[PDB]
Paper text:
To assist our comparison of these complexes, we determined structures for unliganded CCDF185K and CCDF185K -BI-224436 forms at 1.9 Å and 2.1 Å resolution, respectively. The CCD construct used contains the solubility-enhancing substitution F185K and exists as a dimer in solution. In these reference structures, Trp-131 adopts a rotamer where the plane of the indole lies perpendicular to the long axis of the α3 helix. B. Superposition of the Cα-traces of apo CCDF185K (salmon) with CCDF185K•BI-224436 (blue).
Retroviral IN proteins consist of three well-defined structural domains: an N-terminal domain (NTD, residues 1–50), a catalytic core domain (CCD, residues 50–212), and C-terminal domain (CTD, residues 213–288). ALLINIs promote IN aggregation by stabilizing an interaction between the catalytic core domain (CCD) and carboxy-terminal domain (CTD) that undermines viral particle formation in late replication.
Numbering used by the authors:
A (entry chain A), B (entry chain A): 55 to 142, 149 to 187, 193 to 208
């Protein structure tokens, strides 16, 4: 996509922990958190944080059951987020490449949490612009 | 200030919990997390997350002992962050106004964590531009 309000949100599993990964579809920019387990409460909290930072209009996920809880729907309601039903390619590219980077830095960090954020940093800063540069430009332009 | 790489980071206490608050000085944009207690490990983690999202050059704090730990210095080292020694006004305005907003929404949220992120959202979206709009514009412009 190119629409600036669209995000993808998914969980991946690593070392018995859960990594919640948000991707800004238009730029490739990522934010991540390591959580104990997949719960509606954790997803809701993450969504509220994201919406306070970026103009989040719609969110897509590869696992629709992720968004069925009361708690998630309440967070979407309050923040004015809708579910994206307009995406039936480069999003599976982010989550596998993110896991590669995590693997690369894993030894230089003590805790998995740190390695994840190191990987996010590397991903977003890599340039011919970076994902970090692209998201800011897209959101700035859009008014 | 107006320099786009400068952030202020401080902890405030509420309901026996700790709120870590980052302010982008030039825009007034805020990010926050609720943590169990003030530790170097939590500060380091927060800094790494922030640096992966924004071009963080320097960080100031009202409590310098906050940044003395090995773990914090290692996070600053890896992310290429320096301590800001160039600030000897509107930053104490954010942390007290943030507490006001938190108080306003506190009953509409179950957990303090949620109320904090609700307050962050309100603060950043309030317009004549919002803090959220200003940070993106400043970072976009700056190249």
């Amino acid at each position: 996509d190119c629409s600036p309000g669209i995000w993808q949100l998914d969980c991946t599993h690593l070392e018995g922990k859960v990594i919640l990964v948000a991707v800004h579809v238009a730029s490739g920019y990522i934010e991540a958190e390591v959580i104990p387990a997949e719960t509606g409460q954790e997803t809701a909290y993450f969504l509220l944080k994201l919406a306070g930072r970026w103009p989040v209009k719609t969110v897509h996920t590869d696992n629709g059951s992720n968004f069925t809880s009361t708690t998630v729907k309440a967070a979407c309601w309050w923040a004015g987020i809708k579910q994206e039903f307009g995406i039936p390619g480069v999003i599976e590219s982010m989550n596998k490449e993110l896991k590669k980077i995590i693997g690369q830095v894993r030894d230089q960090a003590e805790h998995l949490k740190t390695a994840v954020q190191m990987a996010v940093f590397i991903h977003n800063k890599k340039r011919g612009y970076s994902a970090g540069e692209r998201i800011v430009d897209i959101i700035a332009t859009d008014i």
